[PDB]
mmCIF file of C-alpha atoms and ligand atoms in Angstrom:
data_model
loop_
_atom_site.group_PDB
_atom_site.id
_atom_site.type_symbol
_atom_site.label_atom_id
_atom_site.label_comp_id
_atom_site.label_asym_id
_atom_site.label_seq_id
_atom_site.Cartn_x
_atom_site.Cartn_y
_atom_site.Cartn_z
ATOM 1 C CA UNK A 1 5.041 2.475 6.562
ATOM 2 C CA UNK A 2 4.197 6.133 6.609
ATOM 3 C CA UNK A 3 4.176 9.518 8.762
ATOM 4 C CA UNK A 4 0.481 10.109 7.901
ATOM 5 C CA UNK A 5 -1.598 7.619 6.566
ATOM 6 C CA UNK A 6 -5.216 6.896 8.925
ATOM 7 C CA UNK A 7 -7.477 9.973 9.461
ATOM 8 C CA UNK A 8 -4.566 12.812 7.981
ATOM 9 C CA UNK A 9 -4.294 10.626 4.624
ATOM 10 C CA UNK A 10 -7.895 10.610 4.799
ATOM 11 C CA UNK A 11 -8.806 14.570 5.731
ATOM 12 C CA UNK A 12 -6.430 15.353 2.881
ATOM 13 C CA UNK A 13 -7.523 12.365 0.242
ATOM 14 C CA UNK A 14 -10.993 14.425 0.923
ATOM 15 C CA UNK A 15 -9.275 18.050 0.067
ATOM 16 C CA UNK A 16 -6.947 16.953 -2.588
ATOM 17 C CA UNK A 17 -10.130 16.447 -4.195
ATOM 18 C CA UNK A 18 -10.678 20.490 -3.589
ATOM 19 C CA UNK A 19 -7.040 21.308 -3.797
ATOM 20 C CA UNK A 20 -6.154 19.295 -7.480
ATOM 21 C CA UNK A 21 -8.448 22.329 -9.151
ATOM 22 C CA UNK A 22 -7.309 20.129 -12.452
ATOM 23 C CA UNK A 23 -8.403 17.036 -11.125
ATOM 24 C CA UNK A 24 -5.435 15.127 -12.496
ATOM 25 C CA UNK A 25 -3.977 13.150 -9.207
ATOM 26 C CA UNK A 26 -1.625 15.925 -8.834
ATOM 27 C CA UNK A 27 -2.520 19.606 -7.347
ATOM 28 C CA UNK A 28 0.111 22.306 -7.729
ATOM 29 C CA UNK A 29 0.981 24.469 -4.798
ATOM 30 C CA UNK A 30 -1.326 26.964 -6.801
ATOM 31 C CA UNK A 31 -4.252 25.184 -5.750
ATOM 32 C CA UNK A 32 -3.388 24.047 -2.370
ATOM 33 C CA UNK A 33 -1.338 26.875 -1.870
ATOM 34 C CA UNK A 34 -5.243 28.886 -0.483
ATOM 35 C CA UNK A 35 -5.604 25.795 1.339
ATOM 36 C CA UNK A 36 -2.118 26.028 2.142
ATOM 37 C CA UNK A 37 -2.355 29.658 3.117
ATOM 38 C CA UNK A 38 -5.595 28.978 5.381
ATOM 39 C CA UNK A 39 -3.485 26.754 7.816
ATOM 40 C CA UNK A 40 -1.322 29.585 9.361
ATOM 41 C CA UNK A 41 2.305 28.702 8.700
ATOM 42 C CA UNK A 42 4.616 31.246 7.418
ATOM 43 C CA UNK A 43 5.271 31.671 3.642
ATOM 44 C CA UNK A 44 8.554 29.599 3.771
ATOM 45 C CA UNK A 45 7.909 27.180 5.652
ATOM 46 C CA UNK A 46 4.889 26.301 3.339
ATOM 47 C CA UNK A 47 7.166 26.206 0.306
ATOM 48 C CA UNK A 48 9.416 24.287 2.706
ATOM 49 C CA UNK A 49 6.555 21.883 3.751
ATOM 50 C CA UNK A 50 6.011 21.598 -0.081
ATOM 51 C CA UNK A 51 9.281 20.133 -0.945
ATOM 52 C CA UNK A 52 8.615 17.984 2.472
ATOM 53 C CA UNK A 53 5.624 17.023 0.597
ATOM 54 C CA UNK A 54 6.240 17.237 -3.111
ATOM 55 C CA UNK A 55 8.596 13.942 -2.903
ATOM 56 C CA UNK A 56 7.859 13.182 -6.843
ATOM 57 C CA UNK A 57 9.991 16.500 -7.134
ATOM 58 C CA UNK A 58 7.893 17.218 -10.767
ATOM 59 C CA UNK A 59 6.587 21.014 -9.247
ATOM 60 C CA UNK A 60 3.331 19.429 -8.492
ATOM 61 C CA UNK A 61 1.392 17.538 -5.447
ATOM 62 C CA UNK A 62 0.251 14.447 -6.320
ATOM 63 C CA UNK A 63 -2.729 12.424 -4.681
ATOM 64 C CA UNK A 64 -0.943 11.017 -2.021
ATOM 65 C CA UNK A 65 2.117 13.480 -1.708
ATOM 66 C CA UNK A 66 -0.669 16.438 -0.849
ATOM 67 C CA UNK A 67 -1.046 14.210 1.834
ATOM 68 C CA UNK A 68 2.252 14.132 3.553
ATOM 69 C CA UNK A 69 2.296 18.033 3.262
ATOM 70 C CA UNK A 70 -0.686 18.462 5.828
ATOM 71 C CA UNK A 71 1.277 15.576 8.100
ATOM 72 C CA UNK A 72 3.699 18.580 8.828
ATOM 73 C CA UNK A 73 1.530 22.122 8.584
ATOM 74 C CA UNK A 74 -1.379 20.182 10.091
ATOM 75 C CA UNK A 75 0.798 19.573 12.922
ATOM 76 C CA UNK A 76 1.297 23.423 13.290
ATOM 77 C CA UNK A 77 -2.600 23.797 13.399
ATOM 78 C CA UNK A 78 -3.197 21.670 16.532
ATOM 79 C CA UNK A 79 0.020 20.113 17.606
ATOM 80 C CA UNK A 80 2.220 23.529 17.038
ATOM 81 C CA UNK A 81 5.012 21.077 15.832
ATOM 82 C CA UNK A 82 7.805 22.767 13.540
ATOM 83 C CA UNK A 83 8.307 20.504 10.137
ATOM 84 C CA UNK A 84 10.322 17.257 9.989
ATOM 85 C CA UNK A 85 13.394 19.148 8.527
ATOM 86 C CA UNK A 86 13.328 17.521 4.795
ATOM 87 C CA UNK A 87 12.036 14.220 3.821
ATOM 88 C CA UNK A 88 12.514 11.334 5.856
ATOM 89 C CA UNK A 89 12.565 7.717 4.485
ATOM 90 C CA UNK A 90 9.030 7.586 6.372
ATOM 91 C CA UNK A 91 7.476 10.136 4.616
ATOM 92 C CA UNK A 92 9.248 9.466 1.388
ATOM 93 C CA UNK A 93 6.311 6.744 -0.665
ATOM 94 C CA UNK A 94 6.570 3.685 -1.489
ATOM 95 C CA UNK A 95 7.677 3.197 -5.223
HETATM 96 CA CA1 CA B 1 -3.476 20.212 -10.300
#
């Protein structure tokens, strides 16, 4: 199970690709933060959508956890939805 996972998992698989600038399955919110900063949501709540996001809580995004930050911001780009508060067990990955 999964918030995002079909065409979200697979927009972002595509831009982690451009967001990781070091290539190593994990982009920092340095890289994504331009991408991050092209969607539109406030300063905070990107940082805030991080942490929603950055669930291996090591300061970086990895492959898939780049992916669960868009679930939320992307959500504010055509659904105008506010972020799921912090992370849920749905959004937290399977380990
Ligand atoms: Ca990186």
């Amino acid at each position: 199970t999964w918030v995002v996972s079909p065409a979200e998992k697979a927009k972002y698989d595509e831009i982690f690709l451009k967001t990781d600038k070091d290539m190593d399955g994990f982009v920092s919110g340095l890289e994504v933060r331009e991408i991050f900063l092209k969607t539109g949501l406030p300063s905070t709540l990107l940082a805030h959508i991080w942490s929603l996001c950055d669930t291996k809580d090591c300061g970086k995004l990895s492959k898939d956890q780049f992916a669960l930050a868009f679930h939320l911001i992307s959500q504010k780009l055509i659904k105008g939805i506010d972020p799921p508060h912090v992370l849920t067990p749905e959004m937290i990955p399977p380990s």
